Amino acid sequence: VLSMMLLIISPNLISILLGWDGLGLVSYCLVIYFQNIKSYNAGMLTAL
Amino acid sequence: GWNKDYKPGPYPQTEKERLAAAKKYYLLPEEYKPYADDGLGYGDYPKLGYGLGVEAKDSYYPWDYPEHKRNQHEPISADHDLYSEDRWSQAEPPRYSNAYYFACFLGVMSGCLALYYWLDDKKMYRPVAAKQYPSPGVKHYTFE
Amino acid sequence: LTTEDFANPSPKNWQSYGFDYKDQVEDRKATKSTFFVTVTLCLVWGSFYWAYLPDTQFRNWAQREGFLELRRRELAGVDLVSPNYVDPASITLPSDEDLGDTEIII
Amino acid sequence: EPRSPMASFAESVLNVIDGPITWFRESIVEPNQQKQNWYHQRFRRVPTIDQCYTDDAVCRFEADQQFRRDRMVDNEIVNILRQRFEDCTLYEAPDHMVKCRPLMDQYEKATENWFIKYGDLGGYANAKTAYMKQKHRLIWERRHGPVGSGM
Amino acid sequence: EQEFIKRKHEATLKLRQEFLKQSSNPYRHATGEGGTVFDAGLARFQAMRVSNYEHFKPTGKSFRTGLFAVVLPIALYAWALKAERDGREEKYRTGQVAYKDRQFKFI
Amino acid sequence: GASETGGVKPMVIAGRMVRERERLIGMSPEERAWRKQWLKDQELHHGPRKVPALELELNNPIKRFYRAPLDKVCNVLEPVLGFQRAYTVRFWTGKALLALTGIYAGAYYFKYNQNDWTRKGGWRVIHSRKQCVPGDEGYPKVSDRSAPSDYAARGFNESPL
Amino acid sequence: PPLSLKLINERVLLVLKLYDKIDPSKLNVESHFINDLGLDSLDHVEVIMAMEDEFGFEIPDSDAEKLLKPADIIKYVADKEDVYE
Amino acid sequence: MLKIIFFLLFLIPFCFINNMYWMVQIMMFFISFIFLLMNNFMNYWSEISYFLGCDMLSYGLILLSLWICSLMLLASEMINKHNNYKNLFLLNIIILLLLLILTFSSMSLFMFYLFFESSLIPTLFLILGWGYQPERLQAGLYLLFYTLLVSLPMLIGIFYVMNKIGSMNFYLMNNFMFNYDLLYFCLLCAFLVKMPMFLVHLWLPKAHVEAPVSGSMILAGIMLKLGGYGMLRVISFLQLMNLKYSFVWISISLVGGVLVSLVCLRQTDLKALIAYSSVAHMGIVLSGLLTMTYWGLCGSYTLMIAHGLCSSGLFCLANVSYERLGSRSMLINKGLLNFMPSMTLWWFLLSSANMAAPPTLNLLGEISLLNSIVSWSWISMILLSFLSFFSAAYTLYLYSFSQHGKLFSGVYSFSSGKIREYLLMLLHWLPLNLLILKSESFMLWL
Amino acid sequence: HQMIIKPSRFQWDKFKDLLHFYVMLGVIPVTALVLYANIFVGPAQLAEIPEGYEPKHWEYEKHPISRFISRYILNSDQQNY
Amino acid sequence: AQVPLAIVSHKRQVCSLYKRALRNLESWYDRRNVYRYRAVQLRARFDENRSKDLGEGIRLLACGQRELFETRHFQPRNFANSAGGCAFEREVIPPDWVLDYWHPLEKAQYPEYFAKREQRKKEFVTWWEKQYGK
Numbered sequence A: 001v002l003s004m005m006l007l008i009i010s011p012n013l014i015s016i017l018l019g020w021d022g023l024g025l026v027s028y029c030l031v032i033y034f035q036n037i038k039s040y041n042a043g044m045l046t047a048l
Numbered sequence B: 001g002w003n004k005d006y007k008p009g010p011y012p013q014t015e016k017e018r019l020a021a022a023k024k025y026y027l028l029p030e031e032y033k034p035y036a037d038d039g040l041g042y043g044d045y046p047k048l049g050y051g052l053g054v055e056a057k058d059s060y061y062p063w064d065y066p067e068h069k070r071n072q073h074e075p076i077s078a079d080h081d082l083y084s085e086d087r088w089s090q091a092e093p094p095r096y097s098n099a100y101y102f103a104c105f106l107g108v109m110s111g112c113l114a115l116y117y118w119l120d121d122k123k124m125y126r127p128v129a130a131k132q133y134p135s136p137g138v139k140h141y142t143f144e
Numbered sequence C: 001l002t003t004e005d006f007a008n009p010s011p012k013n014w015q016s017y018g019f020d021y022k023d024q025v026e027d028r029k030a031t032k033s034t035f036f037v038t039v040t041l042c043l044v045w046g047s048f049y050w051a052y053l054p055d056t057q058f059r060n061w062a063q064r065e066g067f068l069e070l071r072r073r074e075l076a077g078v079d080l081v082s083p084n085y086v087d088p089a090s091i092t093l094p095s096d097e098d099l100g101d102t103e104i105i106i
Numbered sequence D: 001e002p003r004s005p006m007a008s009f010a011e012s013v014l015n016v017i018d019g020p021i022t023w024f025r026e027s028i029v030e031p032n033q034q035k036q037n038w039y040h041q042r043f044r045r046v047p048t049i050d051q052c053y054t055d056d057a058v059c060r061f062e063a064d065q066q067f068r069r070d071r072m073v074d075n076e077i078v079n080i081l082r083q084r085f086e087d088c089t090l091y092e093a094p095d096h097m098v099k100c101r102p103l104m105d106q107y108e109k110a111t112e113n114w115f116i117k118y119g120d121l122g123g124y125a126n127a128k129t130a131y132m133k134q135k136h137r138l139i140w141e142r143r144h145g146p147v148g149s150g151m
Numbered sequence E: 001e002q003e004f005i006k007r008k009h010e011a012t013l014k015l016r017q018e019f020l021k022q023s024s025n026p027y028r029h030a031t032g033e034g035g036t037v038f039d040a041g042l043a044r045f046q047a048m049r050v051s052n053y054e055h056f057k058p059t060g061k062s063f064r065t066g067l068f069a070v071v072l073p074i075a076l077y078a079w080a081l082k083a084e085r086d087g088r089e090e091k092y093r094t095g096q097v098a099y100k101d102r103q104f105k106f107i
Numbered sequence F: 001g002a003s004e005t006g007g008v009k010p011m012v013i014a015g016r017m018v019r020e021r022e023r024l025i026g027m028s029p030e031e032r033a034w035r036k037q038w039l040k041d042q043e044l045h046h047g048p049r050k051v052p053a054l055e056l057e058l059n060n061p062i063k064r065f066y067r068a069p070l071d072k073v074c075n076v077l078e079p080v081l082g083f084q085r086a087y088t089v090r091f092w093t094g095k096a097l098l099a100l101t102g103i104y105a106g107a108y109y110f111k112y113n114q115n116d117w118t119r120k121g122g123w124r125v126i127h128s129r130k131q132c133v134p135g136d137e138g139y140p141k142v143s144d145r146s147a148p149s150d151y152a153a154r155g156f157n158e159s160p161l
Numbered sequence G: 001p002p003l004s005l006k007l008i009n010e011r012v013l014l015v016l017k018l019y020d021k022i023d024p025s026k027l028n029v030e031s032h033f034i035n036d037l038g039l040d041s042l043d044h045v046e047v048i049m050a051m052e053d054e055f056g057f058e059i060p061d062s063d064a065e066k067l068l069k070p071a072d073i074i075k076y077v078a079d080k081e082d083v084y085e
Numbered sequence H: 001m002l003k004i005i006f007f008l009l010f011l012i013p014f015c016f017i018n019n020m021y022w023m024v025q026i027m028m029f030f031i032s033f034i035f036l037l038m039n040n041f042m043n044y045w046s047e048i049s050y051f052l053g054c055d056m057l058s059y060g061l062i063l064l065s066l067w068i069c070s071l072m073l074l075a076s077e078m079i080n081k082h083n084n085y086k087n088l089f090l091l092n093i094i095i096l097l098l099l100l101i102l103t104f105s106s107m108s109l110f111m112f113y114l115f116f117e118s119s120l121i122p123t124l125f126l127i128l129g130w131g132y133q134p135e136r137l138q139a140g141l142y143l144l145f146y147t148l149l150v151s152l153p154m155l156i157g158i159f160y161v162m163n164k165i166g167s168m169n170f171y172l173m174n175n176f177m178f179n180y181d182l183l184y185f186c187l188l189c190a191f192l193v194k195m196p197m198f199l200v201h202l203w204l205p206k207a208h209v210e211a212p213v214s215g216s217m218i219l220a221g222i223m224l225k226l227g228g229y230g231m232l233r234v235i236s237f238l239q240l241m242n243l244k245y246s247f248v249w250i251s252i253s254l255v256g257g258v259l260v261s262l263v264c265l266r267q268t269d270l271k272a273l274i275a276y277s278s279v280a281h282m283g284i285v286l287s288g289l290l291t292m293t294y295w296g297l298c299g300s301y302t303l304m305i306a307h308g309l310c311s312s313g314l315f316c317l318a319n320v321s322y323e324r325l326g327s328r329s330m331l332i333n334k335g336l337l338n339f340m341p342s343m344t345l346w347w348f349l350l351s352s353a354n355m356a357a358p359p360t361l362n363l364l365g366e367i368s369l370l371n372s373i374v375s376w377s378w379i380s381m382i383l384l385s386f387l388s389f390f391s392a393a394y395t396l397y398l399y400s401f402s403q404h405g406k407l408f409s410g411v412y413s414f415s416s417g418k419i420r421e422y423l424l425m426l427l428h429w430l431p432l433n434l435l436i437l438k439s440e441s442f443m444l445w446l
Numbered sequence I: 001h002q003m004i005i006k007p008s009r010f011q012w013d014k015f016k017d018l019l020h021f022y023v024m025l026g027v028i029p030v031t032a033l034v035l036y037a038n039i040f041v042g043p044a045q046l047a048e049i050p051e052g053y054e055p056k057h058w059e060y061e062k063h064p065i066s067r068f069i070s071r072y073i074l075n076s077d078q079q080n081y
Numbered sequence J: 001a002q003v004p005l006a007i008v009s010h011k012r013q014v015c016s017l018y019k020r021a022l023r024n025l026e027s028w029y030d031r032r033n034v035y036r037y038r039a040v041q042l043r044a045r046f047d048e049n050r051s052k053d054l055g056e057g058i059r060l061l062a063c064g065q066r067e068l069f070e071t072r073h074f075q076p077r078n079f080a081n082s083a084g085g086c087a088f089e090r091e092v093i094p095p096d097w098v099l100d101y102w103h104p105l106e107k108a109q110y111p112e113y114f115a116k117r118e119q120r121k122k123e124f125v126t127w128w129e130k131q132y133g134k
């Protein structure tokens, strides 16, 4: 949620990247929150 | 046990050395199959795996290591990274060949690009003349 | 072992911290002093010292001088950024016979 | 002044926000504060790299330092002009195509003059390198005409 | 081929009983020092990954792999960088662009 | 001496039956009794008991020092609404105080500690022009600060220099 | 959910008495599926698949060869559901 | 820098007094505290006393080296409990810290060369003495000979520059410029091997896998930064030969870092993957140095400092799991979240720092080093996008496969995480997220 | 209820409590010093340079902590120059 | 204490083909009455070929496996709790010896449970000594 907050409130490309990479990383982590190989491959796909 | 003690040796070139190499790797003599020494080959290493994946192996067998689907002293496949459950491994075999999916997708994309950019110069429009704006000096009239 | 031992654990049985595995006294000094000289000093007091550091690299002074030079140059006809490093009358401008064939780079 | 209930609610919330902070400033912060004086730091003019000799290094340091300081001063000149253009864009929200065109003209002229003085020197820009650039540029505008016309 | 499957099954049963004896040991667990049960395949895989160079010979297949894998993209990429920068440097030093219409002014 | 595990020796006792495929294949009846006794062992009749020493070791004295005035408020209102209901009132008073302190600190910083022209590194607020509808003061209105130097002043026009 | 061995026994005998190729009489937990009853090799696949769609897990082929009576069917279901009472 | 050097010189006799390991760590963190309070440095050379002084570049490099060596004592506790020559190890760390401070505080280039070659000896001692495998002898010999074979003709280059100019001072050498090819190759090839180019990296994974964590961190966090700081000193007076010969090094160092990034996807060793990760990001550093733009030098110095911090932090994690699982690989160390759940937070907070992590200094170094490469040419865009995409493809595979999934089911009982390890991981990550608030001390060295 | 098998989190909680203790033990004298400098001795006020006055090297800075650091601890820019 | 054997019979192959064909058939047809009608149709198709000999049975088995590969559904229905489903191994249970590495103050929350655990450690070391020897 905090990464989403920063990504909306930012005009600059550099701070949109700050929101963007954090949103992608926590989205990857909560895809791979389940401990199995399907969610593992899913997190690899969404991370790339 | 270190890297100098347990190590792939030279290419066997002998049936007796092939039998001793199969006995070294806990691999049955019929099972052992060394890499061809073409400069990029692996001397004294079995060629194992190399199917459509490690995911093709049955999960209902009581493996000693279920996270890799292997037994205890079963030797590791040579390209174990590329054929692992992460990358490029499937449970069932694929329905078509590899060129069919790309061919159908690129055919659909070529058709949609051609149809869209052929119809780019002819666009639908309502019967409306022009949007009216007050720039200084229009002298524009109504129909009253 | 019994359930009375686990319900009332012993002081003498201590889970060791990462520093010293021989004496309990040596852990409870090393953790405190290592947390003092790293977290309190270097990362809090050092960060407070850096937060109120002076303009060692001239950046606030350069901002003030930027406002002042834009104040004076807008008053006169001199442009806001000078295109030349010095005045062109001080440039000697050697002649083409003096140069001959010399590489001129722009 | 309370035209709408939303504006009256915003005025009330702004007053509740505004009250204790100005009380804490005017009652606590503004008393017990001493009146000290700090000054904007002023620099003399060291002699430029034109008057410096080839073997002299005590004066190349002063010329390089004033070249670095003038580069810094022109950097916040261009930065302040860019913030003037951006404040023109925000303040004239539906009409920034008319009001900000002269400010954009001064900003483009400042960027052109900044690149004429400091451009292509690199990371290691001495006072010697900018002077050699200016000499070669003035030689090129003497012989071949202005830069970008041709030849 | 059935006796080959039976011999492989007997070897797999022996290795399975060895794994069940060694992986579930009280006394090896009770020392407190962590580690791994003795697996030959992981050690052979590690030393195959490390000590691979001694089975490498100069062969036209290996030379072709090293040529079109590493050296050839380096050669075309260096040629493309040199050609683009030589054309842009000739344009920049001839005088065909102005100081106000020039890309990447760092400003 | 130091014990990372206590005096109790580390070992596995669940056996091979925790894997899914080792139960569905054939197994010993004594192994079945061991698995049944293991599953009956893992059931707990009561929850975790409250110990004071773990709470004392997991509470540095500074946190107890700045939590004690709210702990007094929790202890007074404990028998009136119960322990569980009064802890919500204790928790959402201190967090309301944190939110009020943060809002007033941000208001004071953004009102009197703005990015002035004398420094770089403040939160430089740039505001847009408010709209003017009919019914507002001075409805026929041109935008002010139309001089070029008035944009992005940051307090330079009021400077003593 | 919560299971016991009598519930598994009642479920298995209920769905076996719902099967029409087997008669409801002469059905016991110790009865063999092959020679004691009239089911062939292919009807055992239908019995195993009925076990799969009832108990919610699929059964492999070698485990289908291992199961020959309702008693080890109950033992096989109780192994995965881990009741053991 | 006489007070710091004499502080460490009288910190030398604490090695011979027994039970004083943590006292040496405490006083070295006190040195880092004092050096935090010594910041007043700008562009030129300040605090000049007996050929010693620093600019902002050298200030940041000494501060990074002091932080890495104090963490290295905190990291190496297996020396203390086993009593595995802790006095000799402490003396090696303090002497190597003196040599790295002295090669960074050098006002003339020949002290930089002399203490730069002097710093190879305690690192070789750490490799040959405090490793764990029989290939220690293959490791320190590769390090010593790959450094020395290219660093010996650079001495001839140094004496050629001295005869031509007459001095080794970095400001007096800035005025001159040279048009000699072999002088350029001598003054560049030693730094091109010391910080690994793709064609000459070989010694790096051999030196990293074999080395002890107190020995891998001084190879990852610093001592590749000697080969960047050397170019930051040398490229100032060889600009014309660099414009003649940059494109081959930029092409090699941009194709490597894609090939190197594809290597890490096909490797199973945990310490080797970070060893090749040091090649790929300092491939970006090497590409950004030889473009002589101002943003290139500033972002290069930023990514040197921040990449040193995150690579030393990543090599901290590869020894915590190694001493608990006996041997490190991807296969043994698969899914350590169910074993150490609190270690996984630092695992992701430092593996994300290896790629572009949003509030860290790694991103700020990377966002400005891409600027110089894009402004250099547009052909480089194709092999930069693949480079960063494959970079976060491999460095997320590290955390991904080591910290997620089914357990190994063949491991024995090991100790859990301790207060020392979490404090060790904290002081690698929170400096990466706290120095961004004053990044101008790590951006502007000019 | 059922006993969930989990690793020991005593060490992580003890590390968090020790880190919070030493962060607060740093911040509280820092907060006291910052409040004493901002309240009791106050910041400086900008003024023009007098013609007969040459200002000292610590009088070019606004905050009293920066003035203290430049006057006592750090060397001047003139000395290094 | 038996493991499955890697040999396969012709009866095993026909049974596996029948089970996989019915799984593909119920993945194609959602409703139960239509699935039961098609299951009786497939039963008749597999019952018509029982009277053939071994070679024609092997050829028909290979043709049926090839045709089932041709008509296989893109998303077959599988049980999520079993292997191959989405909900397979949702959580990973660590081995119990991490409970051996708790703090004694953390062990004080379940003292009866840890005393019972010590009793089962004595029982397990007795069981391991009488099963796998010394």
Ligand SMILES: CCCCCCCCCCCCCC
Pocket (backbone or CB within 6 Å): C045, C049, I033, I037, I041, I064, I065, I068, I069
């Ligand atoms: C008359 C005003 C006095 C102000 C004193 C401020 C002291 C600040 C000290 C900062 C450095 C602390 C290092 C430990």
